[PDB]
Design a protein around this motif. Structure first.
Motif, PDB file in Angstrom:
ATOM      1  N   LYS B 291       0.820  -1.221   0.000  1.00  0.00           N
ATOM      2  CA  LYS B 291       0.000   0.000   0.000  1.00  0.00           C
ATOM      3  C   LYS B 291       0.851   1.268   0.000  1.00  0.00           C
ATOM      4  O   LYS B 291       0.439   2.304   0.525  1.00  0.00           O
ATOM      5  CB  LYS B 291      -0.999   0.027   1.164  1.00  0.00           C
ATOM      6  CG  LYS B 291      -2.032  -1.089   1.132  1.00  0.00           C
ATOM      7  CD  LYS B 291      -3.136  -0.846   2.148  1.00  0.00           C
ATOM      8  CE  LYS B 291      -3.895   0.430   1.833  1.00  0.00           C
ATOM      9  NZ  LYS B 291      -4.324   0.482   0.408  1.00  0.00           N
ATOM     10  N   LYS B 292       2.040   1.204  -0.600  1.00  0.00           N
ATOM     11  CA  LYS B 292       2.967   2.336  -0.643  1.00  0.00           C
ATOM     12  C   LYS B 292       3.595   2.376  -2.035  1.00  0.00           C
ATOM     13  O   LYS B 292       4.654   1.789  -2.269  1.00  0.00           O
ATOM     14  CB  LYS B 292       4.022   2.223   0.448  1.00  0.00           C
ATOM     15  CG  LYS B 292       4.913   3.442   0.572  1.00  0.00           C
ATOM     16  CD  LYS B 292       6.103   3.162   1.467  1.00  0.00           C
ATOM     17  CE  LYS B 292       7.209   4.179   1.242  1.00  0.00           C
ATOM     18  NZ  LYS B 292       7.622   4.246  -0.186  1.00  0.00           N
ATOM     19  N   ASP B 295       4.943   8.642  -3.081  1.00  0.00           N
ATOM     20  CA  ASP B 295       5.921   9.137  -2.125  1.00  0.00           C
ATOM     21  C   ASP B 295       5.250  10.081  -1.136  1.00  0.00           C
ATOM     22  O   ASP B 295       4.351  10.853  -1.492  1.00  0.00           O
ATOM     23  CB  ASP B 295       7.079   9.832  -2.852  1.00  0.00           C
ATOM     24  CG  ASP B 295       8.146  10.372  -1.904  1.00  0.00           C
ATOM     25  OD1 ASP B 295       9.201   9.719  -1.776  1.00  0.00           O
ATOM     26  OD2 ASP B 295       7.958  11.460  -1.319  1.00  0.00           O
ATOM     27  N   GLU B 296       5.723  10.023   0.116  1.00  0.00           N
ATOM     28  CA  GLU B 296       5.089  10.751   1.210  1.00  0.00           C
ATOM     29  C   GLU B 296       5.192  12.261   1.033  1.00  0.00           C
ATOM     30  O   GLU B 296       4.298  12.986   1.473  1.00  0.00           O
ATOM     31  CB  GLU B 296       5.687  10.295   2.551  1.00  0.00           C
ATOM     32  CG  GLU B 296       7.168  10.634   2.806  1.00  0.00           C
ATOM     33  CD  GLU B 296       7.389  12.007   3.420  1.00  0.00           C
ATOM     34  OE1 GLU B 296       8.508  12.548   3.291  1.00  0.00           O
ATOM     35  OE2 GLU B 296       6.442  12.538   4.035  1.00  0.00           O
ATOM     36  N   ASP B 418      13.350  -1.211   4.078  1.00  0.00           N
ATOM     37  CA  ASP B 418      12.830   0.131   3.835  1.00  0.00           C
ATOM     38  C   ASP B 418      13.597   1.103   4.720  1.00  0.00           C
ATOM     39  O   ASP B 418      13.395   1.135   5.935  1.00  0.00           O
ATOM     40  CB  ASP B 418      11.330   0.195   4.112  1.00  0.00           C
ATOM     41  CG  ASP B 418      10.804   1.609   4.144  1.00  0.00           C
ATOM     42  OD1 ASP B 418      10.678   2.173   5.250  1.00  0.00           O
ATOM     43  OD2 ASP B 418      10.515   2.158   3.063  1.00  0.00           O
TER      44      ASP B 418
ATOM     45  N   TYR C 254      -3.272   6.929   3.289  1.00  0.00           N
ATOM     46  CA  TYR C 254      -1.920   6.889   3.836  1.00  0.00           C
ATOM     47  C   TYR C 254      -1.942   6.845   5.361  1.00  0.00           C
ATOM     48  O   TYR C 254      -1.163   6.108   5.983  1.00  0.00           O
ATOM     49  CB  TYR C 254      -1.116   8.089   3.341  1.00  0.00           C
ATOM     50  CG  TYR C 254       0.248   8.187   3.970  1.00  0.00           C
ATOM     51  CD1 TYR C 254       0.607   9.294   4.725  1.00  0.00           C
ATOM     52  CD2 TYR C 254       1.173   7.164   3.821  1.00  0.00           C
ATOM     53  CE1 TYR C 254       1.853   9.386   5.305  1.00  0.00           C
ATOM     54  CE2 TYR C 254       2.421   7.243   4.399  1.00  0.00           C
ATOM     55  CZ  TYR C 254       2.756   8.358   5.140  1.00  0.00           C
ATOM     56  OH  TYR C 254       4.001   8.444   5.719  1.00  0.00           O
ATOM     57  N   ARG C 258      -0.692   3.965   7.976  1.00  0.00           N
ATOM     58  CA  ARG C 258       0.287   4.208   9.028  1.00  0.00           C
ATOM     59  C   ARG C 258      -0.326   4.315  10.427  1.00  0.00           C
ATOM     60  O   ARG C 258       0.396   4.658  11.372  1.00  0.00           O
ATOM     61  CB  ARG C 258       1.107   5.459   8.710  1.00  0.00           C
ATOM     62  CG  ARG C 258       2.313   5.181   7.823  1.00  0.00           C
ATOM     63  CD  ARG C 258       3.111   3.989   8.343  1.00  0.00           C
ATOM     64  NE  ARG C 258       4.377   3.803   7.642  1.00  0.00           N
ATOM     65  CZ  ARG C 258       5.185   2.764   7.834  1.00  0.00           C
ATOM     66  NH1 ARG C 258       4.858   1.820   8.704  1.00  0.00           N
ATOM     67  NH2 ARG C 258       6.319   2.669   7.157  1.00  0.00           N
TER      68      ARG C 258
END
Ligand SMILES: Nc1nc2c(ncn2[C@@H]2O[C@@H]3COP(=O)(O)O[C@H]3[C@H]2O)c(=O)[nH]1
Ligand SMILES: Nc1nc2c(ncn2[C@@H]2O[C@@H]3COP(=O)(O)O[C@H]3[C@H]2O)c(=O)[nH]1
Ligand SMILES: Nc1nc2c(ncn2[C@@H]2O[C@@H]3COP(=O)(O)O[C@H]3[C@H]2O)c(=O)[nH]1
Ligand SMILES: Nc1nc2c(ncn2[C@@H]2O[C@@H]3COP(=O)(O)O[C@H]3[C@H]2O)c(=O)[nH]1
Ligand SMILES: *[C@@H]1O[C@H](CO)[C@@H](O)[C@H](O)[C@H]1NC(C)=O
Ligand SMILES: *[C@@H]1O[C@H](CO)[C@@H](O)[C@H](O)[C@H]1NC(C)=O
Ligand SMILES: *[C@@H]1O[C@H](CO)[C@@H](O)[C@H](O)[C@H]1NC(C)=O
Lengths: 434, 452, 434, 444
Positions: B291-292, B295-296, B418, C254, C258
């Motif tokens: 689920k990534k 990019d944050e 990671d 997101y 998290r």
């Protein structure tokens, strides 16, 4: 049977997914048919019972001996050990869906006779069908063929469900009572499927509904058919657009470039050169630019993709044997790819050398008009721009690209500003220049 | 006494409790006005539901005269200022037009016109505000968009069905083939038969299918062509909105598949090796199952700075409390590093730093499993796990050994590691005030030349 | 006299000339194909055609004396305007359309470019662009429906009335003889044919079959055009709300990945709800990039002079100073209960408060020493000294005009007396507190 | 000899061989389905089919001598061309489309249809060689619609012939009646039936037998798949026709939505809508760096020196020094469009840009009052001393004048560090520009 089955390279697991998808398709596409149509008679009952026994044996095998052997990632490392694999499968949602599917309502055959409405729980196992869809879309080369075939199969399945529901409505109204219901003179499934097509596509032409159950049936069926036809339009347009988006984007960029060059009246020689560039770029690279595709990736896979394509060239050259590996890695990451049309001058005699050219799939020639040495693929030229400070030196020859040469460019200033870190590499390149 | 927060959940529960009778008013008021038998048969039920709608409308003007707004960032609670701001608003003119006491007119005409209650529909802005708040609240926005569009076109189909029944009542019943048939027949005289056949007419017209009887008179011809044009625009709206819903459902999957196919085309063109092909494709499969894939920083570029720093706290400090070096370091450098962190993802068998390169990056492991190894193959000296760090000595350029600032070993990733990247330039730019990292990393250099 | 082509008088003239062109298209095909609407109101269509030709020759004169732009300026040489208009093809189209049975006036449809330019000028100038796009689309399909109705009645007149079952019936019968009945039946036939419903009577002759085939293919392409334009209208109508919903969804998935704390996610949803309720989904730097630099500066100096007329300490700067300021001032919005700068923090930013109530506090203690409101600004003493002075908190949804270090450093050039006075006031506050 | 697959000879040949392929598909199969049509025109179809066969012979004879691209250059060894042509499957299709099967049933001649890749190559080459690309794409999809309509009309009439003529209500009527016996009415009524079935209107007579029920279900399915697949494509094409004006309209209504929200004054409202109307009236809305970011440096600079030639060849000093220098500078140029009554430079601002005047006039205006000192037409330049930053002069390091705009001007911006990295290799033009700056300083 292996000890732990993975997903990526198990063709035996893909055949097992195909068998479980076939049994699920049998249940989900033959339970309404055997429920509504009078096809589950006393003569074919051995065939239907042995088909449901085969599909439940396939379900039980998928429960017991395949799905508790699926590899998964936990905290970064892959998990191989079988008790942890079994606990990971048994805590999941797929396990409770499968056990909710396998609830054996064939023990109600003694209670209320033969009725396939009790077998409806075998349609709950849809996750195996979805993982089969994902796996075939993962391994196929042209996935849009399978996506179009799957959309066609979804339309045929919803039409078969509408044909079964229409035959149930006609059996509830009585066969041949009014003019709306199925009158009973041809093939029952064929005429009910014809009704399902000419209702769910919203075509019309069928007889008009007379009484209230038929009026609200035709109302709800047309109102669902408008959305089913709209979802068919959307799914077909989306699948074909995702198929041809790359070629459509390239053709749109070529059309915008030609529209600009004709909006500002550029002559026919330059328009022929731009047209030839775009046609050779599509015939060779199959994409507009590779740097935009690289610079959306992480930097370590960018460096891996760069070293795997250019280390052969940068080590084939005998002049690049005394450099260092960090120089090689950073310079191969920062190489810029360019393409020269045939007959072009990459460096005319008298210009200041500012780029170090790496040949990759091209044939160039140095030249007055007499040839001196032709350079094959993987060669190098333009080494004299290593000591030029500011202007420095000029180009000492006319180097002319003979064919569709695809040079790799490396600038002067970047070469010097990483080269000042390495005096040993600078010294051995200066000794090669001397 | 109290002033209701317009972003509270009690205000949203009030929006539900007032969007119920407005929607009832629309649907069953056009039904009651056009049929005059569903009005007549259930008269006590319509009287008690109209009294319920009137008391809820009075409660709504009492709530809207007591809700606060935001000026200068503050929530006003002065009820006189709130009543003045509501009084100088067009919504108050709409509410005093909507709350006209037509009980007098209802008893004056004699209960044959429920057309005199068509001022009750003017709280449509309240229903649209309920739909907007439910859209920004709910967890299934595609399902709510489909339900909202289906409710809109169902209101339209019901309205056009009642308009068709009122037109056939105006031209009379069963005079010709297009209108509703002769209602003295007891098969055509049921109220549910009237409404269901009129809705069937409206769907067959507005859904451009059209199996209805063809018109005879000029007004019927004109009404059918206006209704067909409204129907073809509504069908275009339905197809466009369903295509928008289908694109909205899987645009992320489509762009991810497009990136996979584009990099597959690039790797099939540039003749890369097949193990690298399988590595990059399993890499993208792991990033999709993780689920990534985005990019944050591209997620949090829209956010303000303190909120972005709070997301950085809530994501990174639960790992950064498992450290062995920031026990003698301070919260200023913790928040500066959590501003300066950028995550990178790696692959199994991939090297971070080999022996003897000049690297200028520092790394923090996060849900990974790494090991320092030699050049002879797999000789793992020590496995590192979550909460470790490496590559810290080669950015300050301190000596005490014969190496300098060169990576002393080979670091591979065993699993799908990671890391958190920290380069030289940003860390030495932001970290210019604290010598706790200086003394800790000098101790690190002293002990790494001890074990070297 | 010269008419400015980007003025308001020219748009009034585009309206006054796009009324008779839309007269000519609609009513010339209706009169020419119906031959009774012409014969009944003969003097009415004669005087309207005289008015239309008078407006046509006035448009010939206005396009003769309308100015164009060379070298970025207005050309007032009316002889040059005459030659520039005379060498264009619009002049040839105008004198073709001014060449003197209403089927002999079919050259009056040649001024279609004036109507299209009027529709484009209204689509630029009006404040309802999507509503005008819907109005223009419905006007286009109504023109197509009306032209097909006239064409169907012309084909029925060419084959004969009431001979077949597909053509219009016998006009000697007074049920089908009236002009209103004739026009509304032709309109009904063309709606049924072009929307592809197909409730028309079936054709008999070969020319009728060929016309219905061509008409159904035209109806399929027109229905596809309607579906595409209404889908594009829906997409660019809800694009902004959809991209903010996609930003909200990316944030929320997101944070669901998290495992966000409840108070922080409630602050996130409250922030997005404050954005959705105060309509700050628009991004200033993202939308104002298409304007030039001074046009970017003038709207900004309007809004930031509205915010700088409130402050008192830094109003000694005027034109140049604030022009360099409104250029490089950027807005950020802060939540209630938010800290702007703390005790032990390095300063790098100045702020100007507009729409917000800020209060300074002690070390983790709520004590309002001074409440900063609209009319002051803060955060400039810790950049021209250490660390920021004391804690600054937020009472409500405060909005700040952030200011980088480079901006005030560049602002130190022009008008230095004001800045040295205000930094003396900085030293004043420094000797006040310590 | 060898032919070039990117020339015009190969394209003219591609047209001359795409003609009998389409003839074979449509005409051939239309004749077959209409055995009576064949009966009526026999010598004409024999002449046309012999012409199509000799064109297919010359087609394989010229595909045996076409060149390809290996290592980026044209290969011309004819034996290598024959081996490379023998080692593919397209040549197997040319072999199976060449067998002499045949004059009574033209169902035996269906091997001629196998050369479909040649017609598709013609459609692709004409799409990338025309000047109306989206109009040609709509025309290509319309021609595919007409092919599918004709093929299902022939299939409907052939399945009506197989079931029998006039036996039912769904089938084609009885041939021996002279009204339905005409070949024109045969083809036209089959065309009508297939237009109705494939566009799913469905006002045909309903089927009565199960073979006809299955055919109408299958037909319907195909139509609803086919038309959605191809007619939707047309819708997408439309949007591509209107996309540039649509994105400019998106820019204008986002700007107007912002200035309706912020309640901006009407003078600046009319000013910015006049500026956007000027930009769309002069058609300078296409951003050239964004539209040519894909192209390499040589083609970008050749496009630039063929667009900006007439207003760039008016330079005095840097005109014949280095043409490659001029190439690099016009590649690194960047255009902006200014309003009238706009200041380009002010007294006391830091200089980072140089301006080349293109299609506009700018006047050096005074400090306080409006006195036009000198108007600068196209070809001239200004704004160089504050990006040169040289010693020996007054050396204010700001912009030393006021440059105002009298009309809708266009300039060429170029950055200071960009000019510095462009002239670090070439110092002669820099000292010439430096000399000019010094002279200017001396003057004032
Ligand atoms: N003149 C010349 N240059 C060569 C030859 N082989 C490789 N090169 C490179 O080709 C060049 C072209 O540009 P340069 O003058 O800059 O410098 C020259 C050399 O670096 C050769 O045989 N002659
Ligand atoms: N050499 C070494 N480095 C270690 C060890 N454990 C953790 N590390 C870190 O691993 C490193 C890899 O890169 P560096 O040389 O930059 O510095 C080294 C240390 O910071 C260990 O046992 N030996
Ligand atoms: N120290 C201080 N700062 C104040 C006061 N009133 C307003 N301010 C502003 O608050 C500030 C907070 O940040 P700065 O240290 O940057 O600078 C300080 C001043 O500009 C006051 O009474 N004391
Ligand atoms: N100072 C000055 N600049 C002039 C004159 N005539 C034209 N120019 C240009 O006007 C300018 C304004 O900006 P620059 O300082 O950048 O550089 C100056 C010159 O290029 C003149 O008489 N004096
Ligand atoms: C309707 O029916 C009634 C009796 O059933 C009859 O008297 C009347 O004439 C009918 N009206 C029409 C219009 O048919
Ligand atoms: C129409 O009716 C008139 C008399 O009503 C008749 O003379 C004429 O022949 C009719 N038209 C046709 C085509 O039969
Ligand atoms: C067709 O017409 C001929 C002559 O009228 C007749 O003999 C034959 O039976 C007809 N065919 C059918 C199928 O009716």
């Amino acid at each position: 049977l292996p000890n732990s089955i993975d997903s990526y390279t198990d063709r035996l697991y893909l055949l097992w997914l195909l068998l479980v998808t076939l049994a699920y398709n049998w249940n989900c596409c033959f339970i309404p048919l055997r429920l509504v149509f009078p096809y589950q008679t006393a003569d074919n009952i051995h065939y239907w019972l042995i088909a449901d026994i085969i599909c439940d044996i396939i379900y039980l095998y998928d429960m017991l001996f395949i799905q508790p052997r699926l590899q998964f990632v936990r905290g970064g490392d892959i998990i191989v050990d079988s008790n942890e694999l079994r606990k990971h499968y048994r805590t999941s949602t797929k396990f409770q869906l499968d056990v909710a599917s396998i609830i054996p309502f064939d023990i109600c055959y003694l209670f209320f006779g033969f009725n396939p409405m009790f077998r409806a729980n075998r349609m709950l196992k849809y996750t195996s069908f979805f993982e089969f869809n994902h796996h075939l879309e993962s391994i196929m080369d042209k996935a849009y063929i399978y996506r179009v075939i799957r959309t066609t199969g979804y339309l045929l399945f919803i039409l078969h469900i509408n044909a079964c529901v229409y035959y149930w409505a006609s059996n509830y109204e009585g066969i041949g009572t009014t003019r709306w219901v199925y009158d009973g003179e041809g093939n029952e499934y064929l005429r009910c499927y014809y009704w399902a097509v000419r209702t769910l596509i919203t075509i019309g032409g069928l007889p008009e509904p007379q009484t209230l159950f038929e009026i609200v049936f035709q109302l709800l069926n047309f109102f669902s058919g408008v959305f089913v036809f709209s979802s068919l339009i959307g799914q077909m347009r989306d699948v074909i657009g995702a198929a041809t988006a790359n070629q459509n984007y390239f053709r749109a960029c070529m059309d915008d470039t030609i529209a600009y060059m004709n909006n500002y009246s550029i002559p026919k020689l330059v328009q022929k050169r731009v047209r030839t560039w775009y046609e050779y770029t599509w015939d060779s690279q199959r994409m507009l630019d590779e740097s935009d595709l690289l610079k959306t990736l992480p930097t370590t896979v960018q460096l891996a993709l760069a070293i795997d394509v250019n280390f052969s060239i940068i080590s084939k050259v005998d002049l690049f044997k005394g450099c260092d590996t960090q120089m090689i890695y950073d310079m191969l990451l920062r190489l810029k790819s360019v393409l020269y049309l045939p007959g072009d001058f990459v460096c005319k005699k008298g210009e200041i050398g500012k780029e170090m050219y790496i040949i990759k799939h091209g044939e160039v020639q140095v030249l007055g008009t007499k040839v001196l040495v032709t350079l094959k693929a993987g060669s190098v030229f333009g080494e004299i721009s290593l000591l030029a400070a500011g202007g420095g030196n000029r180009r000492t020859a006319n180097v002319v690209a003979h064919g569709f040469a695809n040079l790799l460019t490396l600038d002067k200033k970047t070469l010097q500003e990483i080269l000042v870190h390495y005096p040993d590499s600078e010294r051995i390149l200066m000794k090669k220049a001397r | 006494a109290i002033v209701v927060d317009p972003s509270s959940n009690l205000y949203y529960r009030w929006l539900t409790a007032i969007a119920l009778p407005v929607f009832y008013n629309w649907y069953l008021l056009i039904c009651r006005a056009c049929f005059d038998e569903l009005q007549s048969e259930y008269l006590m039920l319509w009287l008690v539901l109209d009294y319920s709608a009137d008391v809820l409308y009075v409660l709504d003007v009492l709530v809207r005269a007591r809700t606060g707004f935001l000026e200068q960032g503050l929530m006003v609670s002065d009820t006189n200022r709130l009543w003045q701001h509501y009084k100088t608003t067009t919504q108050f003119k709409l509410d005093v037009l909507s709350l006209v006491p037509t009980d007098l007119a209802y008893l004056k005409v004699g209960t044959n016109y429920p057309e005199v209650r068509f001022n009750r529909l003017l709280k449509f802005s309240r229903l649209f505000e309920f739909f907007d708040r439910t859209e920004t609240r709910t967890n299934y926005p595609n399902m709510f968009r489909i339900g909202n569009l289906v409710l809109y076109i169902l209101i339209i189909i019901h309205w056009n069905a009642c308009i068709y029944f009122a037109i056939s009542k105006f031209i009379g019943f069963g005079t010709d083939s297009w209108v509703y048939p002769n209602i003295s027949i007891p098969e055509h005289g049921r109220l549910s038969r009237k409404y269901i056949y009129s809705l069937y007419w409206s769907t067959l017209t507005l859904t451009t299918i059209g199996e209805t009887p063809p018109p005879v008179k000029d007004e019927e011809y004109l009404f059918v062509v206006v209704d067909f044009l409204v129907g073809v625009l509504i069908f275009a709206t339905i197809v466009g909105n369903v295509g928008s819903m289908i694109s909205n459902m899987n645009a992320s999957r489509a762009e991810f598949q497009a990136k996979i196919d584009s990099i597959k085309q690039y790797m099939q063109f540039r003749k890369v090796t097949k193990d690298l092909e399988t590595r990059v494709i399993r890499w993208f499969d792991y990033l999709w199952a993780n689920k990534k894939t985005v990019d944050e920083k591209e997620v949090l570029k829209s956010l303000p700075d303190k909120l972005k720093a709070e997301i950085a706290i809530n994501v990174h400090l639960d790992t950064l409390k498992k450290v062995r070096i920031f026990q003698d370091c301070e919260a200023g450098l913790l928040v500066e590093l959590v501003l300066k962190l950028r995550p990178t993802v790696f692959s199994p068998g991939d090297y971070i730093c080999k022996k003897g390169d000049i690297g200028k990056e520092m790394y923090i492991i996060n849900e990974g499993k790494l090991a320092v190894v030699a050049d002879d193959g797999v000789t793992q000296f020590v496995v590192l796990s979550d909460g470790s760090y490496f590559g810290e000595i080669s950015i300050l350029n301190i000596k005490g050994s014969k190496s300098g600032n060169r990576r002393t070993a080979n670091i591979r990733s065993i699993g799908y590691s990671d890391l958190f990247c920290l380069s030289k330039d940003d860390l030495m730019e932001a970290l210019t005030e604290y010598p706790e990292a200086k003394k800790a990393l000098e101790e690190k250099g002293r002990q790494i030349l001890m074990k070297d």
